[PDB]
Point group: C3
Chain length 427, copies 3
């Protein structure tokens, strides 16, 4: 019904947010795959060889039926140990990516919700303007049929009356495409929503912009993720750097191998029936000294990328400054506009009342009276819309601060009210 | 010239679409690469080594040589079998992408083509308006040069002329840039096209919206794709799962060897010239027991990706319902606008006539006659557009239902009549103004 | 303060560019990592495998120590000689992508600059319109309070006034936001900038469209990129075909090996207990004969990924042709518009006079005068806008041709001059 309920429905099922979670889940899951090369590697092998001879070996055949039980255990691989915390970091970037997506859904739903509401008001005023213009056309028509007004007055009215009728068409189509926006976001169709309580509508000027900036610094999400994506780039310098380092591998094994032989070749105590069993343990030290200049090159790029991710951060800061500062401007302009269009509506109404009392003694005409109606319901339109802009602007500030949430929608119920249906608000 | 014939000219050489064709062609070609590890691997290899013992092997100097054939045909290797049927899926997906593109080029030619006409109508009507203003200015200067009207009726009229004159410089430019956009779509410049036949024009009610949805639900190319990618992701679970399974390789070699020792402690019969030839047939078998928790971690990743692809499916669905329902609404709001602007042009006209008669007997002024001229050629414009919006929205549906077709472009030259041009009509700088 | 100076402060700091500079730098660097396999590989390993025994070979317990400087050097591997150039080409593709970023910054900085400038004018005229309407509301408020007009005149002006007040709020806000958007691109807040000099302002007709198209063909970075990338795709065809070739490989190694048996039946020959010092050296030859039609499949793909890279050029060509031709159209319609509005302002001012005249005698009413004010400070707003669009459109052409640089901004300094503040009023 109202916005909170609509969102609570929407978070329950919305693809874009769930698909974001699945990415976060996998990104956290993949840590275990990053840890695995540091854990015991155990395998089983089995061989069936067979031989022959045809030169010096003048036809010594044989065979094998071998079997292993191989173990690997890295005791010191720094590149491997580094690859784990890279994937842990990667999971962090994805979790911040996800929280960013939780706020986008709120904003997207609020907008979708207030787009529909606003669309209803544009249709209501269009209908109202239409009935106001039609009143004039109908009345002027009656006066004309008894010769009290010229034919011209009637033909000017009918013209303006048909402009609006076409306008109403667009407006009822726009409302019906707004509800379709909201159906795609929420996953549901709503015949009625909570209207805006116009009486209960107040305005609160925002916090100081330097205060808003000082906080955004701490809690903006695009900004934190940036500080994490850069930190990851730094760790990749080291993984590349760990190419200069040696490694140590424990490798234990156990196996059996029984062996046969053949025709007319040779003989003992040279060879035969064997049934070799053997257990093995081993430490493989292995250290790169110079492999083509690769490791130095891989560090350089990892560094250029770090320098690059350093730039994406300042970029992410400048966008936070732009958005916070421009959201401050925008909410202040909304409060200035609401107070403007309010005033406007009043004088638009009093000027219309003047046009009509003017039309009725000669100083004005039907075109003026009609033109007075159009400006009246345009002021009326623009006012109502400003209120919706102001609410959305309260939310965009919250978004820029990276602190948008359930409670900000919950708070918005103070200004909502009576249920309104969708077209027909006929006809 | 007309819409059918322009599309054909675009279809044959559109670089966007042929780029897709390559992507398709290549993605099918790779199947023969996804099969390659499941076939006889034959490799020939020779070498040469020299040794030199210098510790307790002082005076031991080998000098070897080898050849071989190799063969490592694989017998049971499920992952390779998998990646083959995977690459197949990747191609089937890539193809549906291509089939979508063919439908996108039909659509984007349709729009580009109708955008040009819309751009001419707007220029025709703005030019028309401009001369409707010029007659009232001209005849007013006449009435003034002999003193039948005051000069203020001349200077008021001159203004409205100049704001429409500017209005025309834009409407002109937009027709240029429309023909240029069209050229980008179809590689070609067009000096004239087939106009919309206003008289041979009729508007039909569309099918019921719930019928279109289920139609769209079974035919939508965007939808089909998302299903095959969810299905694809489903498979990659099973691929990740075959990491618990064992491999069974068949091997076989055939290689000479001539090792001939040298040195000072090559005295015994360990040293001599051995020329061991050989002929092998192997059966290597591998089966992993535990890899630090990898294969399970890989599977759990593959399952989250399946949820992902499953949610990408829902997205594709919600986007079709939005597209079908909205494109339904606009058909019904085009029809209503075509009817409402037809009526608005009748009224905006008759008003202008009474405005003039009114001006003529002093109950209105020139600034009313001119004001009514504007709302008229604004209604002619709003009307012409409602037609094109209807036709355009009619194609948006059939695209959403995955059945956008040449048959439909053909079925649109059943409303295209007399050819009209696309460049100047026509700068008239006198000046009076 | 002016566009040259502002862009200078923007070129030095702007992060989008500076990152792209670190992406060029790191594709040319990676040339070194493409070359490394043609160069001597050297390692060092210290084996230690203790080995126990059981079943038929029971009681025989060795344990080995080992060290060995390993060395590799490719003698012949063509697709290692080919992966290198393939990474020099991709580097060259980066450098062009960088050069495109250089010009975008110029266009961004210019577009941002003039948006603030034009935002100032719109706000300025809006206020001119406001004070203009206020006078009319004011003097006929007086003429009402002494019976010289009816209340209808006051209330008409009083309403059209309020429309402008509302408008002024938006116009002021737009300027505030427009400045912040300049602060992004630049990293600076600018109190005042060099305003456009409109007395000195002149419009030169462009070159011929066919000269621009011929010019674009040779110098437009989006085309050059597409060419280098197709030439990249061609070189990936040869890399695919390179799978049919032999692989010569020198290797060498010094090494040692302490072994020491310990146990029961430590009594025979074919196994040894040595301390070898091997100085192995030798050539290695590898040649594929057949791999399940892999290489052939990888060539038909590379060939398809070349008609792909080729059709992808006709796309890039149809794009530049559009941006060269349409932006030529746009600049011609700019010159036209600037002229049409120059007139429109002139004729709408003559008309505003004619209304205030007709009002004083009864041919035109209070609304007639007001509406003429509205038209006047709308022709002027439009005349002002048109001049900036023309200016940007000059750059959009230098952009399409792919030859946009500093000097084009330098040119846009004879056109600037007197400073104007960027806030109230
Ligand atoms: C590059 C990361 C900065 C921390 C390292 C200290 C300063 C860089 O020192 C570097 O240490 C490497 C160690 O082998 C060498 O290969 C480099 O040649 C050397 O310049
Ligand atoms: C954008 C809409 C255009 C119409 C706005 C016209 C403003 C009103 O203009 C009026 O028209 C009257 C008709 O009798 C004339 O007598 C007067 O010139 C004037 O009061
Ligand atoms: C009941 C104990 C499993 C042995 C019977 C084989 C049938 C179950 O299937 C097994 O599921 C496991 C999932 O952990 C996999 O590791 C095995 O590869 C798979 O064979
Ligand atoms: C029956 C089809 C057999 C296809 C296999 C040959 C495909 C053609 O590829 C050939 O491969 C040779 C390397 O083996 C190259 O030397 C030739 O230049 C090349 O033409």
């Amino acid at each position: 019904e109202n916005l909170m309920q609509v969102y609570q429905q929407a978070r329950l099922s919305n693809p874009e947010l769930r698909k974001s979670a699945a990415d976060r889940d996998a990104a956290f899951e993949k840590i275990n795959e990053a840890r695995s090369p540091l854990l015991p590697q155990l395998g089983l092998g089995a061989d069936y060889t067979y031989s022959n001879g045809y030169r010096d070996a003048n036809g010594i055949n044989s065979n094998e039926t071998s079997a292993s039980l191989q173990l690997t255990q890295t005791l010191f691989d720094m590149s491997k140990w580094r690859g784990l915390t890279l994937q842990e970091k990667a999971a962090g970037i994805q979790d911040v990516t996800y929280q960013t997506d939780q706020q986008t859904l709120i904003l997207n739903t609020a907008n979708a919700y207030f787009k529909v509401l606003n669309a209803i008001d544009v249709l209501s005023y269009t209908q109202a303007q239409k009935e106001a213009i039609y009143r004039q056309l109908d009345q002027t028509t009656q006066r004309f049929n008894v010769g009290l007004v010229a034919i011209t007055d009637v033909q000017n009215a009918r013209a303006q009356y048909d402009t609006v009728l076409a306008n109403e068409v667009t407006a009822r189509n726009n409302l019906d495409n707004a509800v379709e926006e909201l159906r795609q976001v929420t996953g549901n169709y709503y015949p009625e929503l909570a209207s805006l309580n116009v009486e209960h509508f107040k305005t609160d000027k925002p916090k100081a912009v330097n205060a808003l900036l000082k906080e955004a610094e701490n809690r903006n999400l695009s900004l934190l993720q940036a500080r994490l994506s850069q930190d990851l780039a730094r760790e990749q310098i080291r993984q590349a750097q760990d190419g200069h380092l040696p490694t140590l591998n424990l490798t234990a094994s156990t196996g059996i191998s029984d062996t046969s032989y053949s025709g007319s070749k040779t003989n003992s105590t040279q060879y035969d029936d064997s049934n070799m069993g053997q257990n093995k343990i081993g430490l493989n030290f292995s250290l790169p000294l110079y492999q083509g200049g690769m490791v130095n090159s891989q560090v350089k790029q990892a560094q250029y990328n770090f320098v690059g991710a350093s730039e994406q951060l300042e970029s992410a800061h400048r966008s936070v400054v732009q958005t916070v500062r421009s959201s401050f401007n925008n909410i202040n302009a909304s409060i200035s506009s609401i107070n403007a269009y309010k005033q406007a509506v009043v004088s638009a109404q009093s000027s219309l009342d003047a046009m009509e009392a003017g039309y009725s003694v000669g100083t004005r005409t039907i075109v003026d009276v009609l033109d007075a109606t159009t400006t009246l319901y345009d002021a009326k339109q623009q006012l109502a819309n400003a209120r919706y802009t102001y609410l959305i602007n309260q939310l965009n500030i919250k978004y820029a601060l990276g602190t948008l949430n359930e409670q900000d929608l919950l708070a918005l119920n103070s200004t909502l009210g009576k249920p309104i249906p969708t077209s027909p608000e006929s006809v």
